[PDB]
């Protein structure tokens with residue numbers, strides 16, 4: 001459970017921010033250090049869009065052409081020359097971490113500039129989106145591009161989703177995708193007590209074993225979630241991450257609640 005110890009064990013860097021939204025209790029570790037957020041940013045973009053389009057209006061369709069397609073888009077590559085609903089874009093983004101879906105969501109919101117405008121409004125002067133996928137995944141310790149600190153990122157997740165302006169239907173739609181997202185099973189989901197519910201979105205940048213998971217964690221018996229942000233990376237560009245590191249970090253942090 002000592003986070004200093006797990007860093008030793010895994011020869012890795014750990015960034016943690018956790019907020020029990022009922023009590024307001026926080027757990028912090030390297031919470032002001034920058035990390036590539038990678039695909040965990042898809043949760044933020046999806047929520048921003050859901051602030052803008054009511055659930056009954058998610059049936060709106062967007063046209064997809066060959067220029068929209070970027071790598072690791074298992075769902076969207078099938079839509080070239082076809083239309084897709086905003087509902088299906090978000091499902092593709094959240095469940096399959098589809099990059100083309102996330103890019104389209106950012107475009108629908110109005111561009112990177114508009115995401116930045118919303119983050120500043122939520123009081124986040126830290127989270128720094130500069131590029132679209134997949135380029136945002138090329139992390140470099142020397143650059144702040146597409147990085148955030150566990151604390152800044154968690155505060156924004158809390159304001160946007162936990163204590164924010166989404167309707168009951170849009171919040172349920174988005175948290176249900178995160179709850180049912182099986183791609184996040186080896187991460188926070190793996191380290192919390194088995195009777196906990198975990199709604200997560202993972203991330204992995206291409207470099208420095210940048211491996212992350214953010215989630216809304218519900219202790220059995222509590223309906224208010226604990227917002228949990230875990231960002232990790234290692235010293236070498238080509239290092240492979242070990243998901244167990246995130247699992248063990250979550251197990252340790254959750255003992256604090």
Ligand SMILES: *C(=O)[C@@H](NC(=O)Cc1cccs1)[C@@H]1NC(C(=O)O)=C(C)CS1
Nearest residue numbers: 038039072097134137202203204205206
């Ligand atoms: C978000 O992190 C996305 N990552 C990338 O596009 C960079 C990589 C491609 C292959 C390996 S890294 C998507 N999300 C995830 C994830 O959330 O775990 C993975 C593994 C790749 S696509």
